Every structure is written in structure tokens, then in C-alpha cells.
Amino acid sequence: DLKLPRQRVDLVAPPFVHVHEQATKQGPKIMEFKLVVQEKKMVIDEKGTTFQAMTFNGSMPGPLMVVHEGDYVEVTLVNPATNTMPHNIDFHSATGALGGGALTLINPGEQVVLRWKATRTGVFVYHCAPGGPMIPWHVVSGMNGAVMVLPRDGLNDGHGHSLRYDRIYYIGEQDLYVPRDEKGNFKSYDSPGEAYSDTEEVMRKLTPTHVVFNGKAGALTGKNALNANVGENVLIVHSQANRDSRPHLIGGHGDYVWETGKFSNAPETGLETWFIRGGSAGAALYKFLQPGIYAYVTHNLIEAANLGATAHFKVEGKWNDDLMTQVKAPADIPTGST
Amino acid sequence: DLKLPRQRVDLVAPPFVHVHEQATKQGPKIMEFKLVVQEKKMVIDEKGTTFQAMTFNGSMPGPLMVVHEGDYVEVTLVNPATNTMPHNIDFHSATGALGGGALTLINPGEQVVLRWKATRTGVFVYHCAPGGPMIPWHVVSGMNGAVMVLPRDGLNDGHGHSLRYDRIYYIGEQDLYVPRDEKGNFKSYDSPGEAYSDTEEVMRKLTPTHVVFNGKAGALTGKNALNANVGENVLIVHSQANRDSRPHLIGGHGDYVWETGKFSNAPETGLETWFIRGGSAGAALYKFLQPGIYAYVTHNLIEAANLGATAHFKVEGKWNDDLMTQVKAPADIPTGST
Amino acid sequence: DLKLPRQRVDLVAPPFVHVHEQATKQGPKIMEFKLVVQEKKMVIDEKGTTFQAMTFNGSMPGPLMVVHEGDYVEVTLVNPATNTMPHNIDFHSATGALGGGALTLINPGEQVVLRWKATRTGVFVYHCAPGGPMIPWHVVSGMNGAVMVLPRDGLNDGHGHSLRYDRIYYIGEQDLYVPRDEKGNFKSYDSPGEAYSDTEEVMRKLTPTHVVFNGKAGALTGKNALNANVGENVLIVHSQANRDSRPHLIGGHGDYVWETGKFSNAPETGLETWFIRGGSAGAALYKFLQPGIYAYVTHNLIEAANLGATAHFKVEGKWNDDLMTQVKAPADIPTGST
Ligand SMILES: OC[C@H]1O[C@@](CO)(O[C@H]2O[C@H](CO)[C@@H](O)[C@H](O)[C@H]2O)[C@@H](O)[C@@H]1O
Ligand SMILES: OC[C@H]1O[C@@](CO)(O[C@H]2O[C@H](CO)[C@@H](O)[C@H](O)[C@H]2O)[C@@H](O)[C@@H]1O
Ligand SMILES: OC[C@H]1O[C@@](CO)(O[C@H]2O[C@H](CO)[C@@H](O)[C@H](O)[C@H]2O)[C@@H](O)[C@@H]1O
Ligand SMILES: OC[C@H]1O[C@@](CO)(O[C@H]2O[C@H](CO)[C@@H](O)[C@H](O)[C@H]2O)[C@@H](O)[C@@H]1O
Ligand SMILES: OC[C@H]1O[C@@](CO)(O[C@H]2O[C@H](CO)[C@@H](O)[C@H](O)[C@H]2O)[C@@H](O)[C@@H]1O
Ligand SMILES: OC[C@H]1O[C@@](CO)(O[C@H]2O[C@H](CO)[C@@H](O)[C@H](O)[C@H]2O)[C@@H](O)[C@@H]1O
Ligand SMILES: OC[C@H]1O[C@@](CO)(O[C@H]2O[C@H](CO)[C@@H](O)[C@H](O)[C@H]2O)[C@@H](O)[C@@H]1O
Ligand SMILES: OC[C@H]1O[C@@](CO)(O[C@H]2O[C@H](CO)[C@@H](O)[C@H](O)[C@H]2O)[C@@H](O)[C@@H]1O
Ligand SMILES: OC[C@H]1O[C@@](CO)(O[C@H]2O[C@H](CO)[C@@H](O)[C@H](O)[C@H]2O)[C@@H](O)[C@@H]1O
Ligand SMILES: OC[C@H]1O[C@@](CO)(O[C@H]2O[C@H](CO)[C@@H](O)[C@H](O)[C@H]2O)[C@@H](O)[C@@H]1O
Ligand SMILES: OC[C@H]1O[C@@](CO)(O[C@H]2O[C@H](CO)[C@@H](O)[C@H](O)[C@H]2O)[C@@H](O)[C@@H]1O
Ligand SMILES: OC[C@H]1O[C@@](CO)(O[C@H]2O[C@H](CO)[C@@H](O)[C@H](O)[C@H]2O)[C@@H](O)[C@@H]1O
Ligand SMILES: O=N[O-]
Ligand SMILES: O=N[O-]
Ligand SMILES: O=N[O-]
Ligand SMILES: O=N[O-]
Ligand SMILES: O=N[O-]
Ligand SMILES: O=N[O-]
Ligand SMILES: [Cu+2]
Ligand SMILES: [Cu+2]
Ligand SMILES: [Cu+2]
């Protein structure tokens, strides 16, 4: 019945994003994606704590899918027989059937194909949602990602001027609820099923043990810092499927920010810190003006520094002393100061 | 002194709303409302947990009051002699005297009549506020509701186009703090006064035991699902008097959302999840495009699934396979897949 | 190299703000500020609880700095040798070097001079950020304040109309994490260093023991209520360096609110409650219409009433019975009521 060109997309692992056009003169296509569920033990902090994760495509977050308004998105979801649980997928970008969850429940050893029309522009969360208490558990176990539906003319500033990014990164933030024993040590389990009862107890108190970007504390620091150059306009897509976050680029700003994540709304300009509602994605554009290290954090600094929620950007270029300079280096306080 | 027509309104129990006009060519009226305080033990979850509630008109939330900009709202507040505590009322829509709380403190066996002018458009919280620590306690015991002050021309999209709703529902969300004994069982009390000290201890740790719509887990599910039809524009008013919420219609969107709740501001369009600041009301308009069950949640899914914060809509009509379709039902993974 | 007029500003203690012009026809200046770090034990609640605070200029929050777009801000930061820790400063208003933190780390007995260009308008947080876990600890110990960068034409309503305030107050909100002993009593320490390990344990559970304005419960109540008059337009700048807040003026409104705090964005109008993202400052303008006491709160009323987060305004003038009146004082319920 639906007679449009089909285009297969190969997803990549976050924080990177598969190749795509911003502005396009192509008409609507059927864009074909495949997601494979993988349950696996994963390391989530710098002390080697593990937890029984559940993922789309082996990553937390799941990969970013990018399409244009008016495209049809055909998703094959696969639940390999090595998995232990049923899984499904709910797209916040889609209309009907609980975002697709009501049409996509699959047992281990099965797959399903859903098609949804990309009628609403923005960045949107997708996540597993098998039913009842399984919904939060699968989501906080890692089964969430995002999709971006671009306008066919690309981004704009809401005042008739085009915006183009030079680079795009997807930062998925994950709240984790890892059980502890009587002494406070984190517990380990042999399967997700075995972890469930103790994990649900931690979840009920609504306080995460870890808050991480790209699936672990320190994931996007050190050698996995995000690269940019002075003068580049960088789009940072940020998602949180379950809990609020307050992104902040330390030493920078959000030049254009869609904090509710929807491109039919004009962006706010010149933000210090923005707000991603739990259950949503948002996006910020920034043009780097200064080289050096930048930390990208949630600006609950306890979470950022102590629970794992810090990424770095390493930005190459020349320092602009007009914007900022050290006028006098650290020196002894003058004895004749009052 | 004030010589305007008087009109008596009969309130109804949430989630329904008393009859009202959207656009009106009537001039300013004195709109007369009565609220009666009722302290009573209420069931708040599906396991039969009870708590010592304090309510306006016997419901959590209190009823939605609807008037138009420029009306005068005359509220008789009654505190029957069967109650044990003093109560009052503070309208966020009103100007002066702590929103009216400073003029409305009544002991059991008394009543009071306050009049306030509806000078500001939007949806607004009202709540009890007797003074000091009694303020949070009365509010989290259930003494809060909302009022909607419509523009006389009805809603608009902020770009000169009228918006009209076919149906309106009021979803009041309540954070509850129910004490537990040493084993974790919820405690019961014979009066609000007796519950106070233990409840205040739970409140101080800022983590609710329950988060409910319309006064109990499951209130708006099953046979009390909210009804709609494909093609109907539905206004959902959401209030939270004490704690933030992040509403999400699973399988739908917010077509037009006033998340800060004030109709002098243009709505945002096409939201996945919106944000109700604690101490405020907001409103979202959505036109249903697909039949079936929709869950309306706060998108902290722990709260939604495990603490009680899920409502359902049951939507009648014909499925649109253009928007979404199951291309292939669950099937065994092809043996010749890689 | 930089050849502009220099102007020394003398800071004052919050909630007051140093003298400044709103609209200015002066060109860019080098505005010179000095901040001195002071570590000291401070009283933070009405029962006399103390904690080991770390402050800019001996106050929580640090003082508000006010400049205009295009000015250069030259800050001398001094860390006296009576202090025990290294400190620095990060300006959310500045571009590069982690907002200045990377250029300003000073040991006790040292000072440093940083210059940053005020290229972005709004109110912005500044805070200490020495590195790693020291970042949240210094911030929640009190080392944070705000800066306001005004447009050279002053504020506007985003629709081409000037806004002018008659009075300005800076309300800094501080989340504190005070350790308790086994019985629940707050612990005291002889130095910040000694308090660290126990404080970090409380911080990890993300629930504050106190939430205060101007450094202590009750700071801005009683005789330190904030003064205004009927008819005055008052700007309230609110900052929170670490945790979300939801400001509300009880009995009033936000006439014009920049909740993300940035004057390049038009304000929202007629708000009941607004939202300050942790890591940001926001600002609300209100014209008082009624005399009397107003409470300014975060509208988590538990925090407001029980954890310390209430300020008062005392507003002089004549009552307007058109806006609000008590039609009938408290009276016995009529025996012939149903
Ligand atoms: O012996 C505990 C010690 O070993 C580490 C090493 O990285 O990890 C083990 O213990 C953790 C807590 O049970 C587990 O999460 C992990 O799976 C296991 O290898 C340390 O993290 C831990 O303190
Ligand atoms: O708005 C984008 C997109 O949403 C649709 C429904 O799929 O329209 C919705 O929003 C419209 C614009 O706000 C409303 O007028 C309409 O009633 C609502 O269904 C699409 O038609 C539109 O392209
Ligand atoms: O947090 C309580 C308590 O537990 C201990 C081990 O008994 O540390 C655990 O908690 C720390 C904070 O989350 C982790 O850094 C560590 O991996 C974990 O074992 C104590 O060290 C701590 O007091
Ligand atoms: O890219 C930052 C990196 O460059 C160096 C010199 O190679 O210094 C530049 O950046 C400093 C601020 O971070 C400026 O103060 C300095 O003048 C400028 O040359 C390194 O110091 C710095 O880490
Ligand atoms: O015996 C406890 C058991 O009975 C239930 C039945 O619905 O409710 C009782 O106990 C609760 C906890 O004290 C009370 O809240 C309630 O008022 C009382 O009827 C169960 O909820 C409970 O587990
Ligand atoms: O804005 C609606 C309504 O509020 C009032 C006061 O009751 O005006 C306030 O807001 C005006 C528009 O923003 C301000 O210009 C005014 O100064 C402020 O008091 C009403 O007059 C107005 O209808
Ligand atoms: O939550 C702690 C602990 O308490 C028990 C009974 O001892 O269950 C209580 O808590 C549950 C979660 O809130 C409720 O579902 C139940 O109504 C309540 O009695 C244990 O079952 C649980 O481990
Ligand atoms: O109203 C939803 C209800 O209708 C049924 C058939 O009566 O199916 C419709 O909705 C499905 C998606 O929820 C579509 O896939 C199907 O093709 C459509 O006919 C029921 O299955 C469904 O629960
Ligand atoms: O003896 C405890 C009692 O004294 C008070 C008096 O104001 O304060 C003391 O104890 C507190 C808890 O250790 C300290 O924070 C404070 O520094 C010390 O003077 C009361 O607050 C306290 O209950
Ligand atoms: O926007 C205020 C201020 O920011 C600067 C950079 O210091 O410009 C940023 O924002 C501009 C307007 O949104 C962008 O076009 C620009 O690319 C970005 O660097 C200043 O130039 C401007 O005055
Ligand atoms: O909060 C637990 C418990 O501790 C006690 C003293 O043992 O009070 C402490 O906590 C109160 C709440 O924060 C404070 O008001 C007081 O300053 C502090 O000592 C008990 O009174 C209370 O049950
Ligand atoms: O400024 C408030 C203060 O004024 C008094 C009389 O001096 O009353 C005025 O304010 C009341 C509402 O708070 C009005 O109902 C009253 O009519 C008006 O005169 C005091 O009662 C009040 O505290
Ligand atoms: O389907 N989940 O356990
Ligand atoms: O300025 N960043 O914490
Ligand atoms: O007036 N309340 O307890
Ligand atoms: O998509 N709702 O959780
Ligand atoms: O530098 N701070 O401990
Ligand atoms: O209306 N203030 O809580
Ligand atoms: Cu799953
Ligand atoms: Cu969802
Ligand atoms: Cu009450």
C-alpha cells in the first residue's frame, strides 16, 4: 500500500550519530532501522561496580535515530533468544498504541516490525515499556534512547534564520538504582530477574545511586572526551527517560536551546543552564569561542561530581584574551592590604 | 456597593468540571461558590491503605472552579463542627492577604465569605494555608484544588487563532507521606491530629510514599477511565500544590501546552512531556487522532507505575494505519539472520 | 592593552544590591570588584544549629554584582591566610576556562585577578569550583552568588516597552546538608575539613536538611522583612547554584518573569509560581497592588515551612477592596443550613 522509496539506516553507538542531512530536498521516505535488545552485565562506575543492564543495541543510551518530518519510520525490533525477558518499544514521537508499545511486545526468540509516521518535529525519547512495574524497571535498567525528527528545511532560530550544526552529539543520561548490602557495598546478581526485587526497593525511594552519561561514570572524559574546534556550532541532544536533568556547559552557554525539545517552538537564547524534563529530550546549539576543556554536567553538582554525571569537551583553537584573561596570576596578598 | 449580576455555581467532583461557557459575551458577574471542608479517613492505594485526609468538598483534589477574566469570585468557605482543626483558603489567582488566607481562617462550626477579582487569566492552584508547619501538612493531606480564569474570548493559540475544547478534565496530583512502622507496614491513626507527628517526620525527608491522581492509585483507570473520541480536542488541566510533576500522554502529545498555566502567554506546541511546577497548575490541549487506551502519567515512571500516578483515557473511533501500523506481527527470528 | 575607563564598585551584603543605573548612555567600562573568601562557622536555623560555612565576602549568598552588556568585569579574588582550603571562582556569565575557575585557583595567603567580558545579558550564578568532589562541597557550603548583566537600555517586556524597577532584592537560596548523630541531633565540627566526610555522606542522598534564603532560616522574616510600597515595581533576583527551586510570592504574582534568567528572551507574564533550575538565576518583576505581609517561598511548602525557605515582604499602602474583600467575617454556620 505505502509506495515510497525505502532507505536502510545503519545506527552507530552514542555519543556519535549516524550520517544524515540537515536540510533536504528529498521527499518522504520509508526509513528502516533495526534495534536488537541485549541484556548484559555492564560496568557503570570508576570503581568497577556492575549492574544487570538491559539495552537497545548494547549501549546506554540506545542509538539516536534521525529522520525528517513526513518520513515513515520502520523499526524492526529483535529480542534474541539469549535474553530472558519480553521487551517492546514506545516512541514518544509516534501517535497511537502507547507510542507503539502495544504493538511490539516480543518474547526472547522473536522480532516485530512497526511503522510510524514522523508527524512531529523535535527530539523525542524512545524506551521499553512492557507493562505495569516492568515499565520503570526496564527504563532504569537502560532501555531508552532518542529519535530526532528534523524539519525538511533544517533547524531555524524561530525568527526566519537558518541554523546549521557542524557536529552533533547525543548525551543520554541514566539514573541507576543499584542495591546495597548492610555495610553499604553494592550488590551483584547473576541475572536481571534476580536483581529485580532488591532494585525495586531502591527505586521506590526515588534517589539514584548513580547518574551517568553514555552508560558509565567517566564515559565521556579522558580519552573519550568529545572533540570540537573554536568556531564550530555543536548540537548537543540530551535525553532523560525517567528523571529531570539540568544541563550546563561549564565555560560556555546554550546559544539556542529547545529545552522541551520541539522544533515547532522558537529556541531560547543565551542560557546558562537548561532543563530536561524526565521523559523527554532537549537540544542545545553552541558555537565554541574559546579552546580548552569544557565540562558538560547536570548542574546538581552532587550528581555531576559524586554520582557520575560529567562529560568533557576538548576544544582546539586559539585563546581569545578579549573574552577572558588572567590579569594577574596567583600572588601573595600585599602586606599593605586592609 | 458592588452592583453586578450574581450567578450561583454548583461544583462537581473531579475529574469532571461544572458547566461553563468558553467564549462569552456576558459582562462581569459575581460568581458564587461554596466549599465545605471535610476531614475524613480515605483509601489511597489498591492494597487498601488509608490515611487521614483533609479535603475541600470531600474530594482530592478539590473541585475546579471556572470563571472569566473580570468576574468577581465570592467563595463561602464552611468548616463544619464535626471537623477538629481550623482551615482557610488561599487562591493563587487572587491579589492580597496571602491569596485570601489571611481573611478566611475559620474554626470548626464557622464559615466565612471572601470575594476576589479575577484579574489574571490561567489555571491556578488554591489550597488551605492555616499558618507555619500547618501549611504543608494541610496541603499534603489533600486540601488543594484549582481555579481556571478564562479570557472572555476563550483560549487562543497566541497567533490570533481561537482554540476550543470539546471536553475538559481536571487531574489533581497529590503527593502523600504515609508513616510506616518498623517492618515497613503503613500505620493507621484515629484522627488527623494523631497522625501529625509521624507524618511530619516522613514529610521532612521529602520523598512521598504515594503519588496519586484524583485521590487514589487507580482512581482514573478501569471503569473510571476518562472518555474521548477520535477528533475531539480535550483540555487536561493538571495541578500540583506542593511538588513538581511531568505530565505525559502515552501515545499522544500536547498539541498546545501552557505548562506555567497562564493564558496571557502563548502555548508551546507538539510537546512529548511537560512540567508542572510544584505550587502551580498547567493545561494541555490535545486532539485525539487514534482510538484505544492511552495512559496519562507523570513521566517519573517509578512514580507512575509503582507509587500510583497513572490515569487512563479510553478513546473510541477508527484506527489510522497511515500514522502507525504493525507491519509484521511477532514472529520467530529468521534462522538465516546474522 | 585594554584602554577603557575603570570604575571600582563597592559590593553590599544581600539581599540588598549596590548602586547602579538601569539604562545607561555610558560606554563600556572596566568594572572592578573584589571578593574575599571567608570560611566561618555560621548559624543556619532558628534553633541555633551551626555549620562550617565557606563564603564570598562573609555572606550566603555572595553579593550580587551588576554590570551592563559590553562591560569588562575585573575581579580580584582574595583567599586570606586564615582560611584552610584553596578556592577559586567560576562565572556562568563568562566564556572560557571553566567560567574562570581554571584561572583563579588560589591557596590561603594568595589573590588573583581575572577579567571577563560581559557578552551575555541576564542574571547568572557564580560559584567556587576547585575540582572534583570539592566542587559540590564548596557550593553547598555557601560559596555561590550571582551577577546581573543588564542591557544598556535597561529591561524590556520583549514587545518594545521599557520596564523599570523601583527596588531590587537578591534572594539566594541555599540547600544545606548537615550531618546528624544516631539520635538525629545535628553534629558540630571544629573546621570545614573535619566536617567533610560526614557531610559528603548526607550530600550523596540528595536530600537537604535545610533550605534557606540569605543564609539562615528566618533571615528575611520579622525585622529583616523586605520593604516595599503599593505601586512599586520590585525586581526579585533568585539564584540556586545546586538544586531546583519554585519561587512564589504569596498574595502576589510574577508580572514579568525570566525564569531561565536571560534578558534576550521575552519574559512570561502573570505567573503564580516560577522555576529556577539548579545552577541558574532567574528574575521576576512585580508591581505591588495591596499592602500587608507577603511571604516569598519556594512552593515545596515542606521546604518553605519546615526546612527554612520563607522570606517576608512588608508592603505599606492602602487596601483595595475591589481586588479582594472579606464580605462576611467568620460567623457560626446558620442552624438552617443543609
Ligand atoms: O570485592 C568487591 C570489589 O570488587 C569490585 C572490583 O571492580 O567489583 C566486584 O564487586 C562489586 C560489588 O558487588 C560488583 O558490582 C562487581 O560486579 C564485582 O566485580 C569492586 O567494585 C568491589 O568493591
Ligand atoms: O503540528 C504538527 C502536526 O501535528 C498534527 C497532527 O499529526 O497536527 C496537530 O497539531 C496541529 C497544529 O498545532 C493542530 O492544528 C492539529 O489539530 C493537531 O492534530 C499535524 O496535522 C501537524 O502537521
Ligand atoms: O555509601 C555507604 C558506605 O558504603 C561503602 C562500603 O561499605 O562504600 C559504598 O558506597 C560508596 C558510595 O556510593 C561507593 O563509593 C563504594 O563503591 C561503595 O562500596 C562505604 O565506603 C560507605 O561509607
Ligand atoms: O587550550 C587551552 C590551553 O592553552 C594554553 C596554552 O597552550 O593557554 C591558553 O588558554 C589559557 C586559559 O585556559 C589562557 O589563559 C592562555 O593565555 C592561553 O594561551 C594552556 O594554558 C591551556 O590549558
Ligand atoms: O492488617 C493490615 C492490612 O489490612 C489492610 C486491608 O485493606 O488495611 C488495614 O491496614 C492498613 C495499614 O495499617 C491501614 O492503612 C488500613 O486503614 C487498615 O484497614 C491492608 O492495607 C493492610 O496491609
Ligand atoms: O496583566 C493582567 C492584569 O494584571 C494587572 C494587575 O491586576 O496588571 C499587571 O500586569 C500588567 C500587564 O503586564 C502590568 O502592566 C501592570 O503594571 C500589573 O499591575 C491588570 O491591570 C491587568 O489587566
Ligand atoms: O516497603 C518496605 C517493606 O514493607 C512491606 C511490609 O513490611 O510492604 C509495605 O511497603 C510496600 C511498598 O510501599 C507496600 O506495597 C505495602 O502496602 C506495605 O505494607 C514489605 O512488603 C516491604 O518490603
Ligand atoms: O481501539 C483499539 C482497538 O481496536 C482494535 C480492533 O478493534 O485494533 C485497532 O487498533 C490496533 C492498534 O491498537 C491496530 O493495530 C488495529 O489494526 C486496529 O484495527 C484492537 O486490536 C485495539 O485494541
Ligand atoms: O546542646 C545542643 C543544643 O545547643 C544548641 C544551642 O543553640 O547548639 C549547639 O548544638 C548544635 C548541634 O551540635 C550545634 O550545631 C551548635 O553549634 C551548638 O552551639 C542547639 O542547636 C542544640 O540542640
Ligand atoms: O548573543 C549575545 C552575544 O553572544 C555572542 C557570542 O559572545 O553570540 C552568540 O550568540 C549569537 C546570537 O545568538 C550567535 O549568532 C553567535 O554565533 C554566538 O557566538 C555575541 O556575538 C552576541 O553579542
Ligand atoms: O529528625 C530526627 C530527630 O532528631 C531530633 C533530635 O534527636 O531533632 C533533630 O531533628 C529535628 C528535625 O530536623 C530538628 O528540629 C532538631 O534541631 C534536631 O535536633 C528529634 O527531635 C527528631 O525526631
Ligand atoms: O496592610 C494590611 C493591614 O491593614 C489593615 C488595617 O490597618 O487592614 C487592611 O487590610 C486587610 C486585609 O489584610 C483588609 O481586609 C482591611 O479592610 C484593610 O483595611 C489590617 O487588618 C491589615 O493587617
Ligand atoms: O518484560 N519484562 O520483565
Ligand atoms: O559552572 N559550572 O559548575
Ligand atoms: O489549623 N490546622 O491544624
Ligand atoms: O511513553 N511513555 O512512558
Ligand atoms: O579546595 N578545596 O577543598
Ligand atoms: O499560596 N501560597 O502557598
Ligand atoms: Cu525491555
Ligand atoms: Cu514514555
Ligand atoms: Cu486545612
Ligand SMILES: [Cu+2]
Ligand atoms: Cu500557595
Ligand SMILES: [Cu+2]
Ligand atoms: Cu571554595
Ligand SMILES: [Cu+2]
Ligand atoms: Cu556552575
